[PDB]
């Protein structure tokens, strides 16, 4: 009995609590941006969207949120931000997106 | 070679979709006679261009939905309702032979 593959399981749990955490952050930022786009605040929503994109690419850096899943999240995020922004648009910051 | 078939549009009633009937001849594997069997494919009509009774070509496509893997390539011969009437009569014959 007592095979040291147990170690893997141990490590597994660690990695779980990492990935989860990161992922949660992403989501909580994404909504935070989208809401502000729905309420017509261009600059703040843009800032939050930039932070969210950075977080997404950093999660893609590790085994948490790797290949084009991250591109999916970024594409959906920027699409919804630019679309929701078009209610008396006024793209204040203009940084996060292409003019 | 993405498979290309030819059939008659036998059902209109769906949104952005047509039901096509595609026939096929082949020799019976033992008794050798030429037997003719048909099959209904669901084709994707994006512009609602094709109507009932049209003879169209169907092309193997990236799946649009469940049961939908083909798109209407082009119109071949428009408006021969005799085949449609044959299909309708065959389906209507099912009212008998039950109880």
């Amino acid at each position: 009995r007592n095979l040291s593959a147990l170690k893997r399981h141990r490590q597994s749990l660690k990695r779980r609590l990492r990935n989860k955490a990161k992922k949660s952050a992403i989501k909580t930022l994404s909504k935070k941006a989208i809401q502000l786009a729905q309420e017509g605040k261009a600059e703040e929503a843009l800032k939050i969207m930039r932070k969210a994109e950075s977080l997404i690419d950093k999660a893609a850096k590790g085994s948490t949120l790797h290949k084009n899943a991250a591109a999916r999240r970024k594409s959906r995020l920027m699409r919804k931000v630019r679309q929701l922004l078009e209610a008396a648009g006024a793209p204040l910051i203009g940084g996060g997106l292409s003019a | 070679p993405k498979k290309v078939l030819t059939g008659v549009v036998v059902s209109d009633k769906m949104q952005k979709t047509v039901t096509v009937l595609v026939e096929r001849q082949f020799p019976h594997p033992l008794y050798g006679k030429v037997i003719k069997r048909s099959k209904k494919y669901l084709a994707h009509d994006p512009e609602e261009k094709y109507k009932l009774g049209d003879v169209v070509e169907i092309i193997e496509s990236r799946p649009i939905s469940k049961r939908k893997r083909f798109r209407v390539l082009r119109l071949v011969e428009s408006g021969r309702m005799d085949l449609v009437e044959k299909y309708l009569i065959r389906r209507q014959n099912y009212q008998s032979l039950s109880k």
């Binding site: - | 019976h28 008794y31 006679k33 037997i35």
Partner: protein, 124 residues
């Protein structure tokens, strides 16, 4: 039949039905005896045939013929079932393996010892 009729309905394969539900399709099946009996034969013959009712390891209850001249088989002895019917005794669809598990081979049998299961004698 027309060719079109053969396309529509086609020839029907004929199913075989096993004459021997000595189950699992096994070559032999061991069981325990219930009766050791002497039975009268069918119309054209006349004799006293030694048979045995058997409960089987397959949960079956059959009747088997006792080959040879004399048998040591009794009411509660275990035996093996070989299969094969007796033409003149309706009911016995199986035979008994002699020299196996309780049923010693035929004594003073010197001609055919593969069947009837008796060991080779010695010549002084």
């Amino acid at each position: 039949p027309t060719i079109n009729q053969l396309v529509r309905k086609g020839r029907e394969k004929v199913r075989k039905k096993s004459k021997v539900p000595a189950l699992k399709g096994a070559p032999f099946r061991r069981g325990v005896c219930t009766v050791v009996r002497t039975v009268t034969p069918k119309k054209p013959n006349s004799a006293l045939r030694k048979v045995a009712k058997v409960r089987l390891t397959s949960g079956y209850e059959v009747t088997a013929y006792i080959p040879g001249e004399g048998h040591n088989l009794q009411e509660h002895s275990v035996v093996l079932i070989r299969g094969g019917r007796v033409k003149d005794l309706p009911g016995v669809r199986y035979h008994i393996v002699r020299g196996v598990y309780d049923a010693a081979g035929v004594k003073d049998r010197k001609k055919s010892r593969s069947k009837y299961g008796t060991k080779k004698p010695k010549e002084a």
